[PDB]
């Protein structure tokens, strides 16, 4: 019967758990015990970016460590010149519930998305000189949560319909549809080689996907509430997942273990953003307690508690060259840390 | 600075001026989140993923937001509604079968962590099928709800001119079943405003206006530590 056929998953999961336990030989904490401790890190706010009118929900860095784009509920995308605190573009959106923003790794395209079930993609440079929507990306039966550009023609979007999609910009159609998540997929991050990407949904699971051929390679679990933010390792063989259970966990692709968990007994809030510095051993995780807390990735402990945000921080990302870290919060402010 | 920088700073100042103009509009419109369920009466009150309905009472502007194709999980997208003036909740109140589901929905939206300072404007919409089903013996609240022995006799009430005594004594049970779960928490942070209305009602947008005025009045009084 259907129950008899579905029962095989029980022993399959038992076998995979046994294999995972067998592959475990030494935790990361023991391996990095004798490494030189990271010096006391002090980051001070260098620039604050005012101008947004509502809670900032997403930010993304351009591939020059100079331009960043932010989205807020007033219905406007603002592109900032971080070095000079200058506003480059202010794009009013049709929908006023955007919760994701993407910067193409060329400087030509910016993609938004929210409760409109549409991933609008805009032309930054035009013969008309004004930013216009290249074409709306309909096809999702739920709110979008994360969009990440593959190339100037391919984009990968995660939505609330428990489905991630690969879109061809020219045809405006879902080239590939990823399925398997059992919940509102909230975050996805790409690898340095743009062939693999991970996803994070509300089933407290992380799924590894192949861009070209679809298909899910490995599933990652260990979280207790959900995953609100994900980020690949700079090397590309690991990733750290945010959550609402006050735990950040880093998983290794080559082993599928949970190498370390980043959590302090005095933290009960949720993580909304995670990113890595340009060495690997610095995991920056935003927190709901109006703060962002810097963790040493190798030795699971605390190295920085930089603060100054009035409301919860929602977005965070390190530049490509590791120059600075930008944090976005619900107080309509972006702050650059160095 | 240089010539290009002095021309990029000026362009940024135009954006700030435009952002200032939209600020005046943004803080002058009171966003509302219309919630409820299927076959509850959203379309009657009103007449992709989200549908905006903009109406204006007196001189103030309102921005209603009705969710569409969103899955049956309000979590992870209700966080976007924290600056909303109020939440419009529509209950059919005449089904008499999916009323415990409405009660659970109201409890979930009232006890949500993010919706701690957000009031709920209750619209017990379509109090006409209720009258036609109470006048007839088909649907009695006693069967579905085994707590009608007390009957929720109204110590205070404002019945419309011309009303069956059972009609005005069974609808207040519906109102009390919601006010009981509304008053069980909050601790004065936010309050519920129940109303009785039909499918077609000209005086439906005015109730929203009055409730929103009361909500912001309560919010302003708490800033002076007078409440």
């Amino acid at each position, epitope marked *: 019967e259907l129950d008899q056929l579905r029962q095989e998953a029980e022993q399959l999961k038992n076998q995979i758990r046994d294999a995972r336990k067998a592959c475990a030989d030494a935790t990361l904490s023991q391996i990095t015990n004798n490494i030189d401790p990271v010096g006391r890190i002090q980051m001070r706010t260098r620039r604050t970016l005012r101008g947004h009118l509502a809670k900032i929900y997403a930010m993304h860095w351009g591939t020059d460590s100079r331009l960043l784009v932010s989205a807020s509920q007033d219905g406007k995308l603002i592109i900032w010149d971080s070095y000079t605190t200058n506003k480059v573009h202010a794009i009013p959106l049709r929908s006023s519930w955007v919760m994701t923003c993407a910067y193409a790794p060329s400087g030509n395209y910016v993609a938004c998305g929210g409760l409109d079930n549409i991933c609008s993609i805009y032309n930054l440079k035009t013969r008309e000189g004004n930013v216009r929507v290249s074409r709306e990306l309909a096809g999702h039966t739920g709110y979008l949560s994360c969009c990440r550009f593959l190339d100037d023609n391919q984009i990968v979007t995660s939505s609330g319909d428990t489905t991630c999609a690969l879109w061809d910009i020219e045809t405006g159609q879902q080239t590939t549809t990823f399925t398997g998540h059992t919940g509102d997929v909230m975050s996805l991050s790409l690898a340095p080689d743009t062939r693999l990407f991970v996803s994070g949904a509300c089933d407290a699971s992380a799924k590894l996907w192949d861009v070209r051929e679809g298909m899910c390679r490995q599933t990652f679990t260990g979280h207790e509430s959900d995953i609100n933010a994900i980020c690949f390792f700079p090397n590309g063989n690991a990733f750290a997942t945010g959550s609402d259970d006050a735990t950040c966990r880093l998983f290794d692709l080559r082993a599928d273990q949970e190498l370390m968990t980043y959590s302090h007994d005095n933290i009960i809030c949720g993580i909304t953003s995670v990113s890595f510095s340009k060495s690997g051993r610095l995991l920056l995780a935003g927190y709901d307690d109006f703060n962002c807390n810097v963790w040493d990735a190798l030795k699971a402990d605390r190295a920085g508690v930089l603060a100054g945000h009035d409301n919860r921080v929602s977005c965070l990302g390190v530049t490509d060259d590791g120059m600075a870290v930008a944090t976005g919060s619900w107080d309509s402010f972006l702050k650059i840390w160095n | 600075l*240089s010539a290009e920088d002095k021309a990029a700073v000026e362009r940024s100042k135009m954006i700030e001026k435009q952002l200032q103009k939209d600020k005046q509009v943004y803080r002058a419109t009171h966003r509302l989140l219309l919630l409820g369920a299927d076959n509850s009466g959203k379309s009657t009150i009103v007449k992709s993923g989200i549908f905006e309905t903009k109406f204006q009472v007196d001189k103030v502007n309102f921005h209603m937001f009705d969710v569409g194709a969103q899955r049956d999980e309000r979590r992870k997208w209700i966080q976007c509604f924290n600056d909303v003036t109020a939440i419009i909740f529509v209950v059919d109140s005449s089904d008499y079968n999916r009323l415990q589901e409405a009660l659970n929905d109201f409890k979930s939206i009232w006890n949500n962590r993010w919706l701690r300072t957000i009031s709920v404007i209750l619209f017990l919409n379509k109090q006409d099928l209720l009258a036609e089903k109470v006048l007839a013996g088909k649907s009695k609240i006693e069967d579905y709800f085994p707590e009608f022995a007390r009957y929720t006799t109204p110590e205070d009430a404002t019945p419309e001119p011309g009303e069956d005594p059972r009609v005005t004594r069974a609808k207040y049970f519906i109102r009390d079943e919601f006010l009981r779960i509304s008053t069980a928490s909050g601790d004065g942070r936010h309050y519920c405003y129940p109303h009785f209305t039909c499918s077609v009602d000209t005086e439906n947008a005015r109730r929203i206006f009055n409730d929103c005025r009361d909500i912001i009045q309560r919010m302003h009084l708490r800033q002076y530590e007078l409440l």
Partner: single-chain antibody
Amino acid sequence: VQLVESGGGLVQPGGSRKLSCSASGFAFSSFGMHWVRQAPEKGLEWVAYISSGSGTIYYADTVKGRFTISRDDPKNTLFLQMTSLRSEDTAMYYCVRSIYYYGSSPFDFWGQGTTLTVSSDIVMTQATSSVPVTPGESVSISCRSSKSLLHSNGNTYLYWFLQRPGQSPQLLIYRMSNLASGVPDRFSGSGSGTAFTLTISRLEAEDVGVYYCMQHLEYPLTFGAGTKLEL
């Protein structure tokens, strides 16, 4: 993108006149355009510049306080009204659109112009005003800057231009390195803070013409003689 101007014609000296453009192709509000002069046989000469919102007004030494400039945004039309004229003002007044943010391409598009036959600064030199070339070979025009154009920001603010005979100028190289849109990838340029060279690899047809060099550091905004490339 399109611009067409009107107002040209023979006028006696001292006769105040005005001319206007028609930018009915793009967004006039976000672009700050200029006026560029060009004598029958001479180089270019920047005239004025009106920014977005008509907030910043700039002029040249020979045109300061003379050619009042105005912008009519609702009608998408740029104005430059001139008072009593002199014999010097005998140059076509080309219209050039320009935008300014990080990554912009100022002087991206040019109109067609208009003739007005009327009966200290950063001086730059364009040596070898006539260089012979052949198809398939390569050339190297050179231009120099009395003062270093390498600002502390890290850019260089060098602009290269081309004007085919009987045609409006087009932008090729901006900030000494970046290639403008719509031009072949064979065009390239580099140089130090004082020395500037432009290399045209794999010469082909339609490249025969005159090429210009101008500064965008500082605003007296100046040009060069114009190296004519002929077969």
